[PDB]
């Protein structure tokens, strides 16, 4: 009759279950929460909140001086909302401008009386009670429809049936609908006391010959709806359908206040005409259920007439009222959210308060039974009614049924709005993912869902790891512009490239295509005789064989390192993780210019390959010293007197390049002087007089290649300065590059001045990231595992708000959504002054 | 897109205009309602009613202490229910237990603050806003769904929608839509001033550049709808039509409180889609319109971007706000009943506060203009729009367009449910009547609408006439088991029924049915020799003609006093008047036990024939006296001495009858003790011996007749008590009836113990009803006319309370609904004691 909706999502603040799994663990266990009326607040009795005056304004971006104004049900709303997308897995951010309705039943305006009985101007807006639903719009900036609804105490499921209709006409694409009642004020108490409604023993005794009366119960409850179809389609969990919900009133009644039998099997039949469904497909049905002495036997005789008859199995039977009281405006959601928690637990739950059936409700005739005992619950789908009636005689019945190998090493992305929030939300995931519950689930769906159903919020970590126990081990722990540095040669090193090949088919894929081109520029002409290999296989042997020895000559090291640095770039990009500046030093600023679009991946492997061979053939005799001393004190020295300077890498760290014994000399000076001074592990004096032999060569074979302007700025460590366009485009420039210093100092500087506040070295350790700091510094990858080292960094990047992409982390995954504890909120006290 | 909605009916209560020809009055005069707080009650301004305090409690049937613990703003929508109603033309007792929805706009509880600011039992129901919407649904004993909605300053227009949306679902079949905001409590006044948004001129300055904030109004107002289809198909007057209507929430605006223009562009663009309406055929807007600063200038953005942009022609926009202030959430039912006044009256009228335009609002450039002055309204059908936004950011959008010789003598019926409220009702339908409206108005249309569009109250008259000037005159004047008893012989008169037949198809073809039966007999064997003629020419014959003189023969008597009872019987019938008990003197029994299904009309018609020929053809000498003395006296005084007892017509009224010189014996006795004596006007000595000699003739043709038992109840005045079956159903009976005493008393004695408390004689004059007074008593047709005769009588049965079907009256007249004043009501002060 009516295209079904889906339930999404759901939340509740309920007596003692201030969540759905403490919800179940209530009804479940058969217990209580009525009680007695708390020291901080038939009328001694009642379901209470723990607090009802506590509340995260932080978290919501609302003053304290707003929140102590703010009714404590608008409140309570906005938790319910957050948590109730979150349960669905939306994150609400992507909501922002949508078609998002909010649909709300509410009765009562307690704190408005207690402000009542110093004027401001949060006032206003904290004590309408249309703001209960429209600061939820507001808050989420949806555009939605957005109401609150009073038909007293049907009014949260009338809230429902409205959030349907507006899915079923295209109004919403998505509802919050339920309803809130907090029993703050003694004006209130008073007022249902005296029309004489309430128990004196403070139970419902809901279908039981003591039926007295009803107690009061506060707390509140939201369902995420959308269409069955819609849902589906975006795969979202489904934790129950709507196949149809109705609305009447009882018209004609013996006084205002008494129900109608009449108007009651009336609403029934129809509203299971519609939803397509007979009385013997029925298996539980939610009563309003107040045990009130007349109303307890209408309800049972309507429901009798319109689904006992039909049936040859009693129908059974229960309300919540007879754990939670009754929650007047708010009564019909908890009703709901008992019958989609039995749904999906696929159990019945004892209904309370029932021992001897009323004398005036004969069960037997009728063909209904008060459900005793937790017990399954199995086809006669399962399908269960849920009512909600009025004391003005607007009536609601719902009719509900039951819904229709990924990386090695994983990431756990937490977040939350403070320092204490997030150690909470690990607290709490910790204690989740070690639960029965946590433990059903995949530590790769955990992974999944923390990454991609999940808000990132200001205050962020990453653990990682193999399996849950290590996991948790973590989370436990934790409870208690980008400038890319592409690196040069002394940063290869055996097997660099091979974890990061085996753990990321990106990286892979992309090291293949580089390792291809340059494996064909290498046997035409290769810097060891005979060798018509793979440079892979050279990069990924074990440090001290024959291959690894290869890695070292700088005919292979060079093409190594553009092969190692485009593969990693490659796989950043895919995470989402990309640069505004780059810089290499050396031979790194051949990478740089190929990722920023200068050169073709051809181009650059001609150009790094020829500048590999023609440098290898040189002969031996050169050396290279890193010296503690200035560009000042260097020049100085050498103006006095084959050698020159290399590098310029701080304002007191300069490499010296030349003939062995001329570097010596200078070594020996700077040492002599108390100075640090390191010889570089090379085969040739790099930067140095020594190159001046293959400049000519290597000149004819960059005017071979194409250069374009640079789509990323791109700093000179020739100029130590940003690059003109025109720079980088001349082969003359890469000749002087080969020959002429480093000025990487400068260009760290230069990138300082443009805004870069963090620096990320592009290679296989972390030479030019000790070099930055010496002039935020991460390394892409440093004693552990490439894909370890890596995703520490990447780590770091996002905990200092970096949008990384960790959904595409988990590509190539059958991700299943999983069920995450809520945002732990972090309450405050905010009230009325008097 | 949507199926349209017809509106059939409003009804509107707002300062200075307590009804929609008012409120036309107050809005075409370019007046303002704004005024200073009222005694008994920016913020020294606003629209108020005259009174809130008066209600007329005893009109629901609702006890002086429930009216006093009750919300004035429920009472005043329980008034504009039933003048809604009344004002479509529905009799609202017609409307109990069908789907009829209720939905109303509050969003302000001021009654409850002063009580909470003696704790009883009616302050429950009386306090609670749900009741505002659910005691209409209770007072009607309606079925459809029945709700309040809050989204503050855009409750009512919401409310709208949502009644829209039920009609267009089939959940309800009719609908009340709109809203109430009274502003009672000095506690709201102050909170609105604290929040700073009140004009301190007290003024909605709409467009203008005084713009300074808004000022406050109270008042209510309602339409019924229905599906354009369903209300075409039943005839009903068309107001207005919705063609379509849209809700949306601001979402992300620059604070909770500020509107966006975004949010009212997609709002616009939305709904004049599925409206199927372009910008150009858009003739006016009714603006949401406040006077404030912020709103003012970003509701003239929008409808500039949307509805100004597609023209060629400024759109004229204005705001009921200037008039009457702003009603909160009840604005937006202000708003859209000032629109479909507009429409119907195929007028616009002045935006008040109006002279130089917000700098802030370019009104060229948008293509928009305050509409300053009253004017006819042309097509660019009329369309108009009506928006009305909430300060949380709920908005909602209405498209409303332009809706797409009878009895001689005229029953006006008027009650009410009191004598001062009848005295109310009739001076009001006076100058109603008097007025241009009421000139405009057919009084066959007048009478027709009072019959079948009002409802029939406790206290009852009926008023007559040939035009407006007689009836509206008997208003001015009024302003300061039912037992038939039929006629006998005596009762005749010359031109009795030619009036009725004149008057009354229904008599004319059960009179000329009867006659041709009739005609038939007498001209097989008439009782003048010669006469083969016609015997209604006979009985409509001008007094003192020769056919005149005919209608004494007792030949054509009897079948004359058959043919006129039988006719007024079956006239009565097609009114709904009918007995529960029928008796007649002599000849008027033949007539009782046909209509009482004894006798078909065929056996009836031979019956009274020969019963008349036969008694015709006896001989002169036959006399009958009325005699002031009782049955006993006569029969003492008979027994002591061709002559007997007639009649007895009461305690002390006997006929005696039989040879002219006994008779005249008996009469001097009587006289001679000084009693009344009255020779009666008769051919014959009825009901005496000499009638012995036609017995066995009479006894002949009763015996060729066909007796079922009866299928009412009817007395004998042969046993003078209720006919067993059997009795009537014998030969023997009507013999027996020719020749014994009519025992009139004791029949008259039988019906009242069988609860009989009005009499109606069913004939041509008076005779048989002075005669049971002299044992409610009403004449069917006595100085006047027989259809004014006939009026006064039913008027009288219907008085009293018999249920008159005065809608056939009317049967055969192309009737138009008219537009009556709604009840009078009678108001007294019901308030809290402090
Ligand atoms: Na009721
Ligand atoms: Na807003």
Not at 238 to 253: K, Y
Not at 720 to 742: K, M, Q
Request: with cysteine.
């Amino acid at each position: 009759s009516d295209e079904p909706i889906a339930v999404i999502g759901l939340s509740c603040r309920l007596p003692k279950a201030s969540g759905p799994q403490e919800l179940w663990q209530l009804l479940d266990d058969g217990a209580s929460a009525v009680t007695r009326v708390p020291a901080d607040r038939g009328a001694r009795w009642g379901g209470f909140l723990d607090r009802v005056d506590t509340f995260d304004a932080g978290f919501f971006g609302i003053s304290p001086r707003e929140a102590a104004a703010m009714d404590p049900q608008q409140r309570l709303v906005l938790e319910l909302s957050w948590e109730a997308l979150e349960g669905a897995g939306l994150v609400p951010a992507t909501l922002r401008d949508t078609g998002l309705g909010v649909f709300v039943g509410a009765a009562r305006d307690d704190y408005a009386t207690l402000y009542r009985r110093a004027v401001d101007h949060h006032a206003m807006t904290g004590l309408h009670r249309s703001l209960i639903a429209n600061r939820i719009s507001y808050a989420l900036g949806a555009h939605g429809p957005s109401m609150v609804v009073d038909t007293g105490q049907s009014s949260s499921l009338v809230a429902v049936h409205l959030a349907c209709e507006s899915l079923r006409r295209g109004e919403s694409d998505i509802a919050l609908a339920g309803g809130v009642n907090l029993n703050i004020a003694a004006e209130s108490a008073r007022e249902t006391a005296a029309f004489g409604g309430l128990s004196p023993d403070g139970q419902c005794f809901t279908f039981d010959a003591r039926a007295n009366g009803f107690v009061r119960g506060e707390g509140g409850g939201l369902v995420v709806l959308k269409t069955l179809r819609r849902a589906l389609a975006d795969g979202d969990l489904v934790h129950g359908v709507i196949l149809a919900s109705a609305v009447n009133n009882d018209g004609p009644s013996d006084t205002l206040t008494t129900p109608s039998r009449r108007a009651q099997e009336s609403l029934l039949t129809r509203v299971y005409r519609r939803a397509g469904v007979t009385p013997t497909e029925v298996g539980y049905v939610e009563l309003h259920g107040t045990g009130t002495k007349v109303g307890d036997p209408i309800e049972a005789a309507a429901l009798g007439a319109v689904l006992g008859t039909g049936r040859d199995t009693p129908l059974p039977v229960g309300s919540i009222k007879t754990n939670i009281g009754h929650l007047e405006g708010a009564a019909g959601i908890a009703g709901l959210i008992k019958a989609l928690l039995q749904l999906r637990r696929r159990r019945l739950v004892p209904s309370l308060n029932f021992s001897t059936p009323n004398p005036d409700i004969p069960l037997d005739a009728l063909n209904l039974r008060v459900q005793q005992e937790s017990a399954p619950w199995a086809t006669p789908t399962l399908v269960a009614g849920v009512s909600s009636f009025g004391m003005g005689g607007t009536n609601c019945h719902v009719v509900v049924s039951a819904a229709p190998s990924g990386p090695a090493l994983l990431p756990w992305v937490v977040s939350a709005r403070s320092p204490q929030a997030l150690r909470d939300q690990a607290g709490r995931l910790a204690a989740w993912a070690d639960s029965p519950a946590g433990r059903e689930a995949s530590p790769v769906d955990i992974g999944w869902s923390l990454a991609t159903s999940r808000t990132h919020f200001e205050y962020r970590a990453v653990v990682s790891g193999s399996d849950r126990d290590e996991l948790v081990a973590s989370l436990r722990a934790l409870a208690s512009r980008l400038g890319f540095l592409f690196s040069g040669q002394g940063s290869q090193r055996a097997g660099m490239g091979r974890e990061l090949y085996g753990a990321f088919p990106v990286f892979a894929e992309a090291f293949d295509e580089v390792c291809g081109v340059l494996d064909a520029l290498l046997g035409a002409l290769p810097p060891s005789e005979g060798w018509a290999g793979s440079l892979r296989e050279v990069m990924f042997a074990a440090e001290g064989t024959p291959d690894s020895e290869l890695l070292d000559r700088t005919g292979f090291t060079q093409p190594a390192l553009f092969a190692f640095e485009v593969a990693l770039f490659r796989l950043l990009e895919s995470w989402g993780v990309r640069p505004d500046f780059v810089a290499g030093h050396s031979v790194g600023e051949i990478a740089a210019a190929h990722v920023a679009g200068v050169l073709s991946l051809a181009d650059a492997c001609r150009l790094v390959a020829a500048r590999g061979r023609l440098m290898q053939a040189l002969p031996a005799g050169g050396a290279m010293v890193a010296v503690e001393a200035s560009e000042e004190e260097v020049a100085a020295h050498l103006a006095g007197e084959e050698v020159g300077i290399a590098a310029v890498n701080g304002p007191r760290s300069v490499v010296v390049s030349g003939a062995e014994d001329a570097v010596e000399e200078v070594a020996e000076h700077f040492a002599g002087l108390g100075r640090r001074t390191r010889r570089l592990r090379v085969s040739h004096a790099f930067h140095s007089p020594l190159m001046d032999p293959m400049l000519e060569d290597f000149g004819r074979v960059v005017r071979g290649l194409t250069f374009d302007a640079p789509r990323l700025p791109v700093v000179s460590n020739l100029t130590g300065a940003l690059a003109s366009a025109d720079e980088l485009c001349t082969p003359e420039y890469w000749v002087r590059h080969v020959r002429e210093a480093v000025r990487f100092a400068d260009g760290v500087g230069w990138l300082a001045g443009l805004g870069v506040s963090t620096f990320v070295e592009i290679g296989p350790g972390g030479v030019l990231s000790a070099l930055t700091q010496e002039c935020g510094v991460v390394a892409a990858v440093r004693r552990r595992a490439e894909p370890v080292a890596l995703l520490s960094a990447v780590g770091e990047l996002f905990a200092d708000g970096y949008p990384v992409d960790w959904t595409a982390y988990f590509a190539g995954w059958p991700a299943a959504r999983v069920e995450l504890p809520t945002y732990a909120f972090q309450r405050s006290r905010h009230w009325l002054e008097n």
